[PDB]
Design a protein around this nucleic acid. Sequence first.
DNA 1: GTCCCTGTTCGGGCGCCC
DNA 2: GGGGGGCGCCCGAACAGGGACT
Lengths: 395, 547
Amino acid sequence: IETVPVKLKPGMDGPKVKQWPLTEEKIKALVEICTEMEKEGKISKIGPENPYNTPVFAIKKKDSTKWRKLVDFRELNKRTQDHPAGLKKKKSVTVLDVGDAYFSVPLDEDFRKYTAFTIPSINNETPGIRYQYNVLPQGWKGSPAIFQSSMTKILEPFRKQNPDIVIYQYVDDLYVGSDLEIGQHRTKIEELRQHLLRWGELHPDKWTVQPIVLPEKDSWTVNDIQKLVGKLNWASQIYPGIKVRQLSKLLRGTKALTEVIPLTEEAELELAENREILKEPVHGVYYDPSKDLIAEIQKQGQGQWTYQIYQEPFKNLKTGKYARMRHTNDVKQLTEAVQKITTESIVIWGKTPKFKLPIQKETWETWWTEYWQATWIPEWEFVNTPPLVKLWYQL
Amino acid sequence: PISPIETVPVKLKPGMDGPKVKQWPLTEEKIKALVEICTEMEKEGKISKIGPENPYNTPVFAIKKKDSTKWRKLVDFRELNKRTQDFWEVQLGIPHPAGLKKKKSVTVLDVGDAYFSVPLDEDFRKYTAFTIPSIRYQYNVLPQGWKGSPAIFQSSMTKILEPFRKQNPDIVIYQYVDDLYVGSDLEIGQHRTKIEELRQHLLRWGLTTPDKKHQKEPPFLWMGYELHPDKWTVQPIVLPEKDSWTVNDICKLVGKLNWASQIYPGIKVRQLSKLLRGTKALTEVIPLTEEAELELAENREILKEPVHGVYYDPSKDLIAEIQKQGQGQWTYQIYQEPFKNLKTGKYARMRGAHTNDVKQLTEAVQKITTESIVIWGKTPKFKLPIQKETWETWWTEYWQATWIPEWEFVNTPPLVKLWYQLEKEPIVGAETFYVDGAANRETKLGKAGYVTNRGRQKVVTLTDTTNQKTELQAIYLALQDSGLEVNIVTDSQYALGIIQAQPDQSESELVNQIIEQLIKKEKVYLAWVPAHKGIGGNEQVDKLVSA
DNA sequence: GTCCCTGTTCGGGCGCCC
DNA sequence: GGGGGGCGCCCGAACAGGGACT
Ligand SMILES: Nc1ccn([C@H]2C[C@H](O)[C@@H](COP(=O)(O)OP(=O)(O)OP(=O)(O)O)O2)c(=O)n1
Ligand SMILES: [Mg+2]
Ligand SMILES: [Mg+2]
């Protein structure tokens, strides 16, 4: 088949990211997967005169005897030349991995060199083994694009036959929502997979926001109120309606932290007012597809994680909470969090967020691939957060 | 002979042209050596004489080789290298004897004149023009001084070995440039037959294997080690002994010890390492500190004793044990059977202006894990001098995600501990201090001070300071003037973030003094409040320190 | 905006291997 | 004396970001 020419963004050069060390398990898998891909003409061996590189690793689904290869194409995607509102409302949504579909389309010869990657060896027994792609690579943003036309053709009948079903794709992923019973949904999914075979679970209606909420108690110490005023002072950035004037007034003087303060009539009111302001939703937040979704996550402790998505500060598109059983592995939990938040954002806006991760770069890089199960990878950066904001979203 | 392998196409960077560079003057002894080498290569088709139709040129010299009875022709291609395209290096690291498995039969081979067996691209040959003066040539093979040569050689060597590896999946070939360690589970006779097969295979591809460099019996010399059948050792290390030390000599001593720490436990180099903190040139002499002087002897003593590593049994677990050396210095041993080290090492990086021993221990674990993954491709089990409870406290309290993989406590002091603990709730019957700082950006003058619920107030004037500093000074002063239990309220995110992280060491004299106080105290509680919102009595103290 | 502090990255010197 | 690539180690420059202040 003839190939679509593909460009880099102008003034931009191909990726040059160093491969990280892999475990024996992942390397054995990769070497296995790669030799087959080489037989099927899908990838070719290349030299070091190709100066590009993109990291590669591998993930093992659940309890299975099958590894999926996974190329970190985040950089390449950034450098590569350049949504169903109903889907977030289905009672059930299944995610299928239709990446295989891509290996059937060839890839622009003049582009192949940017898809170079390297298999490492245990103990550097040998130099890296370098490959490049000859077909459309999973994980590359160019892949759904080129293949979109053929993707519509596969589906148009299934859609005609099932007009109540919404099918969405994000790179290697097919998101499929229905309003059916389970079993009816599942049997319907097996239908699409069988329909897909001839060509060659989520519950977005139990997604919940985590509101800001204020302590309720019968006696207040100076400390209780000092915390309260500070938390409200910050919240008043997210809701201009909040006020901490009356409550401040009680902190007139210079008093012992454990002194109890009887709440005045006004202060009792301002407090009631504020409780209500927090219930009334964030006015004026318009999703902009020309800007990046930022995600912040705060570790709350004891398996509780809180998160917010916004493109501009204090202008949250969403704010959430993430609960987990209270041998807890913080790093495992955080990457399970990041995966679930990315999933939501793909569904709600069909785009991945930039994460600000509350962890040390090296801790995270040492371990996150042990817990990854997605076919995509969000951009991210690392932050040592003000322990101020942790108390703000505290439940 | 020259490999019949395909060349690897290379090119200059765009807009660039080959190197024109005068051949600096050589010693006679070397010119004699070079024509000896050149007349030989030229017969062998490895270099070609050029005419005037070649504009370019690049210097050339020769250093004796390691045996020191033969010479190595080198070319200072520093300039050509600036103008040659980029390569992606394919050599990802360095094989380590501790990652080798026990083999029934072992061999070590070198290739004879390795680079000069691999053909260089035709179109790129002109740029290699050089001149032997007493006759001027270009290269037809890879030269030793070009930045293309290592990756091209390493990659070619890998292509050449692929067929053999495919055919002999169970013979293990550690390939380091042209060095080959070949191991098998065969009896010596059958192994030797396989080695002949390997050698003929390399010969058909143009790579000779001189018997001089063919090891057949142990101990094998390989990558700077000696490999005996059940143990390995590093080749003897020799530290300098000057009575006057320069930066260069120091750096040369640091390196040699770092290298040593892979199998000699206990090595430390902090005292040495700081010496070169300000020093701005290799030439600069430096006086040893009594501290550093003291280190060297400790190390110098460590080396005197005999040590070895063992090979890796994959059917047994990997264990790593960490010890604390004080000063942000850590040592580890990786083993499978006790008192039989696989290898050793040290961690000593200081990440952060402020930190404590639990963070540093977490950084050690991360480092050893990454390193274990490279060498054995799996994580070790840990044995750490930290109580399970200590870790849990830290993990609970800490606001970052943090984690150590499977591990077990080992009561080998000095144990790692948190040195103080902020109260989660305000302390009843503890004086409340409202601290604050202000500083003038222009004049650089400041004030730190507090106000207490018991009527006390104090203000201290500072010089050459910063807002952040005044804010830290205010906290210090309140710790200084308070009893063993104090409640402190600050409006400084900066200060609260530092202290709340429970550091026990800091680059900062001030934070060190603060840390000192915090440890002396029975109970401390740090509250934050937002500034300039008239909150009492952050309000009253803010008034005092601003003038 | 500026100044301050703290983090990352990248480029030096050395070590070791070929 | 004058070269190359890899990994390691330390160090100091140049950033990048956030808070606090004019
Ligand atoms: N200081 C060095 C040492 C080696 N090499 C390269 C070029 C060599 O060809 C190759 C392998 O090194 P050897 O010491 O084995 O040297 P040769 O294989 O060139 O020669 P010999 O026949 O003496 O082994 O690594 C280099 O560029 N610089
Ligand atoms: Mg050789
Ligand atoms: Mg102030």
